[PDB]
Design a protein around this motif. Structure first.
Motif, short mmCIF file in Angstrom:
data_model
loop_
_atom_site.label_atom_id
_atom_site.label_comp_id
_atom_site.label_asym_id
_atom_site.label_seq_id
_atom_site.Cartn_x
_atom_site.Cartn_y
_atom_site.Cartn_z
N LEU A 146 23.20 87.81 110.35
CA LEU A 146 21.95 87.79 109.59
C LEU A 146 21.48 89.23 109.36
O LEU A 146 21.05 89.57 108.23
N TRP A 185 22.82 82.66 106.67
CA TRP A 185 22.73 82.96 108.10
C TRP A 185 21.43 82.45 108.69
O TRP A 185 21.40 82.03 109.85
N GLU A 186 20.35 82.42 107.89
CA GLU A 186 19.12 81.77 108.37
C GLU A 186 19.38 80.29 108.68
O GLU A 186 18.97 79.78 109.73
#
Length: 511
Positions: free
Chosen positions: A86, A112-113
């Motif tokens: 992230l 990635w969140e």
């Protein structure tokens, strides 16, 4: 009405990489697959369940993969890897905002969140999520050899038994159910008959077929390559003969399905497979600062420097067209083979990892097949029901040449020598019962780790053969050290480094 049966089988597997290094090949290989294949597949399974979409398929999780997914060090390592990714994505968005790479960078941040949030919501427990998908009926789960050992070449029936039964025991421990389906590593099969080892010195003698040991372990079906049922040339231009659309029953009572050529090529072909479409994310161009992938395939023959910026929106949209194209192929196959079985078996990490958009493609295919009047998606358990052709299978695999050449060659003779010596010594050690129980259990782990087909697979690959040699040499060295005599603290260091199979049973070598 009289529909073809489509059996999608995904073989999820990685060798034991926990505690052995991070990159290029090491723990990060597992974290990549967790992020890009396994978590996205879980989200497909969650959605199909939520929406009542009935399109089941079959998923193998090899015992050695499952042992790592369920491990505390791996859970922590994944969490750290995804946090770092992230941050890398945020940094690339900072650099690439206002450039042609902005859309790719924005997408990576969102990915990635989502990955962190989903992993957190699963309690970091992918094995539990797969158990829950099986309970809901969206997937059948199948097992495999403990460490994906190359079944036909293991030198003792006791060692093959230990691989099969350790896999079954691992599945039972994780899922609280007995497995009926099994993935033969590399679809590698050997029938009953006289056997002479390719290297000294397991003994020559008549051995039971791999299928007979499977039946004894409660397994009822597995999957083999086309040429094992239709003869002729191996798929690895091989057509799809009638026999490949039938369920086969062997003398032992085991049933097999054969790999469908057309659906394999349509996905895997380096020249016309879906992943080579120009819009899809290019795997092999990495960002010089972050290592992230911001470029698209562009053309199959394109140099890395010629790759265009990745547009995620156009790429994901393309999967819908490819899903319809694939379903068109299944319909054509169904017309040729009324009420037949189409087995489409693939290494799972092709989807989402190597072909980034491939999990979206799978979801789109399944949603189409849920509504298709000509082709029904089924589990392997359902696919193998009904009339079967009585068949005897020749020895072979789904590898290059359809035989054992990939795993048994001049560069793996040293490997097989060590495997055979260790297998013989493990049996004898189990029979004597003089070493401490813990030493026997860890020696068993080291033998199983040594027996992984992943190592010899790479002995003719220039960029991987040194690595693979060090891995197999170290599991062999550890194995022999434990038998010859190691201190308790040397034992504990091996137990911590090499920790699959908490219930490893050396009595399996007395089979």
């Amino acid at each position: 009405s009289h529909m073809a049966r489509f059996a999608l089988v995904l073989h999820a597997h990685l060798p034991y990489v926990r505690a052995h290094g991070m990159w290029p090949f090491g723990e990060e290989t597992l974290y990549e697959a967790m992020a890009e294949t396994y978590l996205p597949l879980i989200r497909v399974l969650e959605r199909l369940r939520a929406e009542g979409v009935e399109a089941p398929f079959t998923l193998g999780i090899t015992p050695i993969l499952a042992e790592q997914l369920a491990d505390a060090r791996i859970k922590e390592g994944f969490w750290a890897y995804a946090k770092d990714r992230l941050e890398r994505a945020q940094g690339d968005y900072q650099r690439y905002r206002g450039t042609a790479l902005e859309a790719s960078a924005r997408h990576q941040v969102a990915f990635w969140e989502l990955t962190l949030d989903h992993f957190q919501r699963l309690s970091g427990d992918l094995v539990a999520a797969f158990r829950k998908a099986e309970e809901g009926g969206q997937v059948e789960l199948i097992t495999s050899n403990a460490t994906h050992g190359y079944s036909p070449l293991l030198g003792y029936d006791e060692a093959l038994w230990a691989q099969i039964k350790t896999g079954v025991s691992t599945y039972r421990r994780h899922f609280a159910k007995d497995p009926t389906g099994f993935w033969l590593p590399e679809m590698a099969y050997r029938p009953k008959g006289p056997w002479k080892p390719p290297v000294e010195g397991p003994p020559e003698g008549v051995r039971p077929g791999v299928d007979e040991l499977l039946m004894r372990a409660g397994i009822r079906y597995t999957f083999v390559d086309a040429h094992l049922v239709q003869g002729g040339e191996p798929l690895s231009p091989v057509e799809s003969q009638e026999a490949t659309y039938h369920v086969h029953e062997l003398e032992s009572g085991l049933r097999v399905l054969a790999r469908n050529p057309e659906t394999t090529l349509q996905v895997w072909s380096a020249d016309y497979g879906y992943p080579g479409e120009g819009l899809y994310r290019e795997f092999h161009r990495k960002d010089p600062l972050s290592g992230l992938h911001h470029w698209r395939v562009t053309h199959r023959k394109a140099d890395l420097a010629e790759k265009a910026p990745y547009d995620p929106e156009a790429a994901f949209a393309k999967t819908e067209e490819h899903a319809r194209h694939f379903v068109g192929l299944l319909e054509r196959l169904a017309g040729r083979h009324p009420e037949g079985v189409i087995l489409s078996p693939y290494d799972a990490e092709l989807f989402g990892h190597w072909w980034y958009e491939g999990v979206a493609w799978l979801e789109a295919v399944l949603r189409l097949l849920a509504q298709n009047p000509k082709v029904r998606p089924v589990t392997a358990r359902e696919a193998v029901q009904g009339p079967a052709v009585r068949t005897a299978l020749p020895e072979g695999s789904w590898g290059r040449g359809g035989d054992h050449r990939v795993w048994l060659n001049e560069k793996t003779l040293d490997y097989w020598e060590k495997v055979y010596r260790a297998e013989g010594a493990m049996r004898e050690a189990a029979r004597r019962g003089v070493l401490p129980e813990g030493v026997l259990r860890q020696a068993m782990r080291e033998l199983l780790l040594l027996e992984a087909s992943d190592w010899p697979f790479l002995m003719e690959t220039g960029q991987a053969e040194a690595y693979a040699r060090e891995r197999y040499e170290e599991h062999a060295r550890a194995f022999f050290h434990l038998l010859k005599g190691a201190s308790p603290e040397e034992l504990r260091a091996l137990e911590e480094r090499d920790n699959p199979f908490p219930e490893a049973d050396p009595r399996l070598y007395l089979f």
